[model samples]
Target: ADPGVEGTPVVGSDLDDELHGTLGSEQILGGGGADQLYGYAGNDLLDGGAGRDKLSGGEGADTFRFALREDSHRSPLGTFGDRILDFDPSQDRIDVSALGFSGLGNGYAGSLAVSVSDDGTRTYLKSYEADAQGLSFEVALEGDHAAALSADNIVFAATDAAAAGELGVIGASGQPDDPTV
Candidate 1:
């Protein structure tokens, strides 16, 4: 049954891509099965609680989620950003969708390679590193600013930086209006 208060309940069998619509503060408990869940906006919360659940934050300044089981600490994963996420006990994996990184078609700005176990306990979040200009380029969650440190600031990472460097003495602030070389 659709949980819409204004419209009629959209009833159908639970299957792949089962439900879609806007939901307010409501709780949906899916049976022991694979289900696709979407939190369509507002300050609503969802706990797949079980089964492989897929959730989306939609277009709201909302909170995605996670879980951790009792034996979870045996795994080495802790927390990210500021939110508390948990692992699925059945699969023993910590759901990171709470960290606001959706795989495709989403404008998430963070980048990392990670592998997590089914129960959400074990996780491996590794940063990508590349060797460029006799040095390693590391992609970190550097807040707001993008920069590279090197001799004479001799190296350039982004094309914008290269263009900025060509202009003149711009300093580390990098001319926002007109970059200097």
Candidate 2:
């Protein structure tokens, strides 16, 4: 049978395939191979598991989750991050917090060093100086934008401050403690 159709929920196997979702809320999974998964309409959950993948949340509030086995800074096979097209900030979200980050506006006053390109096509968020718990990631917009993104558009997720505190991951100054403990 076809791996997926335009109006149905589908699951793929360990081979490259094209999967599509219907006009209703649906779930799509791309297992093991480099695949393309599309949520044509409605709120949908798209999980592109393993290999390089492409995902697009067509409409409604959709959440896209990524599983990273390596640092986001490195590009293997000359391939970098996944491509997310048509991301509507008003109704869509990317959950990298699961990769160990705290969403913005969730309390925990920390510092972030952000730089947005003049054309707004590229944005970078990195750990600020003196902040031990630093993270660096980039968001590449498909087209030029004004780049008026605030914390609302950026969901920064890291290990919980309290939990990291208990583990001595953080210090009084909001920096990571020495690992020689």
Candidate 3:
């Protein structure tokens, strides 16, 4: 059946699930199955927990989260990562700020390696080190010539940072409009 509600905190089951969020900020969590999640409108959070997941932030500044690793058996293509289908780098954002960069607030700065696919269909940003979970992740924003997106198009602002008013949108040149904490 179709799922939709002018709602938040919507949860899905351990089957191929389809979900949609409301016009307000929402938290949509998908289960351990191939899932399709849509953030219709709002600064919503979409986490395709563990499966070959597809996410679309319809119309709004939204955030999509990903957890990638060599052992992750949930990849759609039987790999360590998933894809964001309708990623709008112009207005939407990818969230990896929770991974806890090893340095950062610890009096040291961290490092990141950025690259684009040969076909110019995707972009990758890899931190110099793994996070506390001993796992490093990547955001593979998929679409036409996604490689054109610069590093500043990616944001590592912690989730709460948005609520705290510390969230700064990154520019096309790959720098945040405001310094992030």
Candidate 4:
């Protein structure tokens, strides 16, 4: 982003790229690859497109959007998932609204479970319904955000919807927008 610009969006590519958000409400989309996205300020929106990306909403009110479950899917080696670093529950948000987690929060309940790391720095949200299908997955939040995480910061929609419109941003010329996000 240009130093004179505010809230400029950064788009990444298929290789592991480092993308950063600007001072205002910027958008950062990690493309079809393993990438790192950092939102230093603003109520930025960061979406890890389709790989084991790293997302850090450094400051302000940011939304870590997960358009697909596989974006943060867990594997036997435990290296396939994305990591949320410096997630401030009071100001940041975890959006899984596009995942169609039916029995989740807002009355239906009992499908979501929370697990903390032994060191207590990481918090994981394990979906029981997803677990039943043998897809076993977990979304991990690192740092003190685990303890501060409340129902207020997590968005669990009743069903899955098209995330394309919700997660899209303008891409640089010659670069394709992240369709999966």
Candidate 5:
């Protein structure tokens, strides 16, 4: 279904693709530059044409097609359920050390590798950071965001630059494509 955004897009033009749809369903159109894509309840294949986009497969098997734009960075920022890959101000780097659990696919070990910029403050960890101990952590979009965190409870306090907003997973047993309020 349409996520309040128009489907019509200009060919060979830059568009911000903002969309959400069910698996094995029709394509949910979006704009370029910054798209919002969601794979609801089932197996789905998503492709972000260009620009930085937000992608997530709600509650099923899904594959994301990522291609780095010549004008952009390496890869698109992704946020799977229970996996919040974000830029940590404290570490001043992209953290992906905990994605091995319920968030990412099984058998996936820690990130391949990580590197820190010449500036000691900027540290990049390729692996998804884990806090299985149930400790809480915070991700702040900006200082005004107040830096959010989570314990055993899954919280959606800060805005997700990857998925744009909270990346919630719903079971196929419930609303297959709608967000539960």
Candidate 6:
């Protein structure tokens, strides 16, 4: 038997690294600096710690987490934000609890900005803030976006993480080289 193509799994260091996850339910965490994370089959967790990193939650239900906005912030306000390759709302989601977007209240209102690509092949998601500093994070979702993301796909946590046992060992692989990233 064989595993998925571009096999093994993923992880990263304090600098830019190419982290690739395996064909299992992975939780690949890209630490400091700009990094790249790719997740495959099973339920995967992809979190780019900081810098303008890239994330792709391939196949299966996946979760893209962000503890802060700077994790995907860009300058001059362009498509330089973190690029999300494939975000299928039917089985994917985003988590931005640490930033305390409680006002979202399980419903998306303001603070969420949308931008479409020139070719209309992708959509951008960023947080709006005062002073126009624009370091409030941005995620470039690949391919024909729709109605601009909704709160139903974002986790605000009043209890989502722990309550749903996302940070637990439910789908953990329990492998030495595959520790939860």
The lDDT of each candidate is 0.31, 0.53, 0.56, 0.63, 0.34, 0.63
lDDT of 4 by residue, 20-112 (tens): 656677777776777777788778878776777778888788888765766676645454557888888667767765653534432122224
Instruction: Kindly provide the TM-score of model 3 when superposed on the true structure, using C-alpha atoms.
Output: 0.58
All predictions: root-mean-square deviation over Cα? 16.6, 13.0, 10.4, 16.9, 17.3, 15.4
102-149 per-residue lDDT for model 1 (tens digits): 231211122233334444343433222312322211111112112212
Q: Which stretches in model 3 have alpha-carbon errors above 4 Å?
A: 1-11, 66-78, 100-128, 131-134, 157-181
TM-scores of the models, in the order given: 0.32, 0.56, 0.58, 0.67, 0.34, 0.66
Task: Give the per-residue Cα lDDT of candidate 2 at 55.
Answer: 69
Candidate 4 lDDT for residue 11 = 35
29-125, model 2: which lDDT tens digit per residue? 6667777777888888776665666667897888665554322222324433455566675566665555434434221222234455665464444
Candidate 2: segments with Cα more than 4 A from true spot: 1-11, 68-80, 103-181
Which candidate number would show the highest TM-score if scored against the true structure? 4
> Residue by residue across 30-106, what tens digits does model 5's lDDT show?
33566656656655544444454554545544433222222112323332221212322222222222222234221
Positional deviation of residue 162's Cα in model 1 after best superposition, in angstroms: 38
* Winner on lDDT (3 vs 6): 6
lDDT of model 3, residue 51: 65
Tens digits of per-residue lDDT, candidate 3, 77-160, equal 444455677777667766555542423221111224456787566665444445454555555556653434443344554433
lDDT of 6 at 83: 75
Model 5's alpha-carbon lDDT is: 0.34
Instruction: Sum up the clashes in candidate 3.
Output: 1
**Candidate 6 all-Cα RMSD:** 15.4
TM-score for candidate 5: 0.34
